[PDB]
Design a protein around this nucleic acid. Sequence first.
RNA 1: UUCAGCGUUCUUCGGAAUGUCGCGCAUUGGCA
RNA 2: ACGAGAACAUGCGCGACAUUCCGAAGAACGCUGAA
Lengths: 311, 135, 137, 210, 210
Amino acid sequence: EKVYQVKLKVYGPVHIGSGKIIRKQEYIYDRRKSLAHIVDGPNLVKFLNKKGKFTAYLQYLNTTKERADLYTFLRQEQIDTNDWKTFVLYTERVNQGKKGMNDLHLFVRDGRGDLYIPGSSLKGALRTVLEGAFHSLSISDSLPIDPKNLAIYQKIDINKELKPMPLYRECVNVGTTVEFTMKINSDDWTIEKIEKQIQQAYLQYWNKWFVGMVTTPGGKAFIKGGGLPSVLPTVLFLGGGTGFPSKTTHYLQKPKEQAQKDIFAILQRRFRNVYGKMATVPKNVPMVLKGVNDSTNKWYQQGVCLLEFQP
Amino acid sequence: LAKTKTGEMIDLNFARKVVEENKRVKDNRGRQEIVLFNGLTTSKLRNLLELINHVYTKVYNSDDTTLSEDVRDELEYLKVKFAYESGREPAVRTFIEKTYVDKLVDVVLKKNTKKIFLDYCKYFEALVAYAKFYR
Amino acid sequence: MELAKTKTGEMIDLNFARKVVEENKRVKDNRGRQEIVLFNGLTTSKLRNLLELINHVYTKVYNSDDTTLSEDVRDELEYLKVKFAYESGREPAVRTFIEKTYVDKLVDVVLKKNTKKIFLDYCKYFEALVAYAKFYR
Amino acid sequence: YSKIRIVGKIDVLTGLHIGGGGETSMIGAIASPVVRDPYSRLPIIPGSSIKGKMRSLLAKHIGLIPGQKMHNQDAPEILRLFGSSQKGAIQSSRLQISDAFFSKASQEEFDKKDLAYTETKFENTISRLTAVANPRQIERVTRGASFDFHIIYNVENINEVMADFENIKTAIHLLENDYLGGGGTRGNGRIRFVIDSIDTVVGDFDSSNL
Amino acid sequence: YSKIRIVGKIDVLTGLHIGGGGETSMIGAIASPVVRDPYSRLPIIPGSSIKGKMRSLLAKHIGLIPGQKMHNQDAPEILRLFGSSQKGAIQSSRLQISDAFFSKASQEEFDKKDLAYTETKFENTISRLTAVANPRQIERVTRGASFDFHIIYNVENINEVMADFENIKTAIHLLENDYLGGGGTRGNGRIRFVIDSIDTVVGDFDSSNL
RNA sequence: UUCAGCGUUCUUCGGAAUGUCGCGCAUUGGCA
RNA sequence: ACGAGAACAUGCGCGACAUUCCGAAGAACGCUGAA
């Protein structure tokens, strides 16, 4: 069974969902800092009972149920940042697309707590492309990545406009390279075949859905800001929040009109409030593109990565 | 576990009873749309279940019969997390006040035993299961 | 076993378990090939998961010398009805199976009897449901 | 009649999951528990799993006979090392692989870092047509955990011993490149084998050269 | 005529499976249970199992004549210790090995901490051809559990007693490096005779140095 | 323009043991 | 002054051998709601 090193470069930030979403009240975000401090709840609680401010915390959250940010409260009580460090697990830069972060999706971490990409996630991303076996393909868990390459990126819905959604996802930063080891059986999989399939699937994704998405005014704004890099080859979307055109094989196997109609029927059946009320197939199915931006105001497509294979 | 107001024990049977009491038909547009606890949905219930499950796994991995200090701190956070959720959503508030979960966590804290925490976790699990059953 | 009497007064027994599987057996010619469908779509894996739950309670009581059901055993039985309810809500075929076989109703009878024999009898009936489901597939 | 004793450590390079059955599970909690020692409630690696993976890896490496149906049809080396129940040709197993227990060194290491022995991974199966997902929570032994492995070899034939130990070394190499436990093709189960001491515990065989 | 009583404990290093059949098994339950005393429903280590395993290991250590078909062809020391059945050469066995019974102290150690005496182990076999796994559940005695042992040695010839006990020690040493019961080549039945107590219960023989 | 996330999946499907022995030998009987 | 008296159904013997709890399975799909 041939073994190939698999290097993944993240063109656009990737969030693999640990399975945990944290409310703004749980974390500390300072807009001027542009830094969010992840706080282990039980320790913060214990700290606030020790200081006697726990009653004040409870009254604060009750007073403003819709907005319960910790930063505000901690500032209101004049608690020093040195005092904060005790109940702060770590700190990560924030790429806000709007103000105050509404909620945070935390990246997946092991029992040791090092950030890593599950070989299961990569395998599934490849499998979506390569369908058309799967015990012969082997994908390993990623080598743990340095936390310096993790930041929070705002979720922006791009459909005739760029609207920042109330979702924030810790994501592997752009430029970061993730290393995996792939083992394949010559009688089932050839690495040239895998790479060619991925390239063809990308091309199908680009010509059937991406171009129509660009034609919308929000897509034009996304492209003007640098949303589509020139290099974007072999492209795999491994991130959460990428969208319906990936993770499904409709655009990879069906004609553009046929694939659009089938996906539209699927969305009408599953989401009867957004697409069920609609009576006609729109220009793009699904309607909305997913995008992150940066402080340099450079836009990135969510979860877009380039895959390199070496013998 | 504990006895509620008007002298009713907390049981999985009581979980079924409290889930079915707050069930209302409320048919809309000639179609039946079941609503629980004045509109509580399954997503909020699953969120609360995840809150429970983290500490449940932590306790289940432990061998001692007494809750450790970190378990007690997690239960205090659980009290805070329920209060934050009850605040934002009226349906979550109604569910919490009808199921007496925010008081059962205090009962578990005072008992300071693995068995009482496991039974409370089972009770919350039965709440989720019976909400799924009556949906 | 005379575990229970079902609506219309029919007894619950291993022979009844064979009959209940037989009544709820249909032949659907999906893709031309004739396929057996039990309880409007019950799968082997779902029934095996239900059988796993019974086994965990069973190993306790079956090993136990004492006749009366232990309080923890009674707890596991109450949990079983909660799991029954959960699986019924999560799968229509499982709800059909529970309604037709009356397995959930029987667990309450086993709790009422507080007897190892009525427990072993409930376990036998559940095992027959599984065995007959295998035989008629 | 000599017995050679090999002791050492199996080290978890990636989260390792060996399935266990009959474990009650809470709704929304871990639904795929790893095998655990009932007394200490600690993760354990079954010697049956190690023996099966090593035997399968070695048998496939030397080469299965075409249309092989049974384990008793393996190559004679594999039959001598791992046994054979063939009718009229029953062969003893020189390898006696035992249960690998969670080492006290790795347990103390974890307790120093306040880390649990078994991590919980969240995975899902996504439909590639409707994009409907089915979330699963699994249990994997945390990376860097070590297990005390203990293997007994029996010296039935003095001449055969050197080739047998060469085959055991080959099987260890196979199991290092290969995974142990389930979901290996999705990254789980990568392991490392270190040796503490190869000693002859019974008889006068000289195991220092091994 | 003297009788020396050897009383002690056997400790389950790894899970012990000595099978006992005769009972139909429920679907989905353990296919192969362990032998258990009927009255206490507690597992037992049969004296026949211990005697047979000790005799086999001692015969392998002393040596087997080429093409040995019967157990009466063993070495004269083995026939002296464990008994013989030849026509005109029936040797009474000096060793009477009793059934080991689960220790009350191990029972208390398990009743507290609420641990079951026996553990269900979920294994599978993976076909060489279809690569299809067929599962099984086997009962094993838990590692912490300990079995009280009881052996009687009859002093028929006072001269050989030391040598005979040496053989016994050798056999026990072998049994410590070997396993007991079934499935021991995949990690089952590892034991140790940590507790020994030797006393002349009948007669006037001197067992102080035994 | 601001303010917020919300809803849905919570494990699934297979495989559930199999094959091998199922008492043998001595006395006894039988033959001589 | 019982078809009787004397007479251990006994000796030897591992419920054992072969058997991966595996195979497949991206934590992510829609984007909207309120003011």
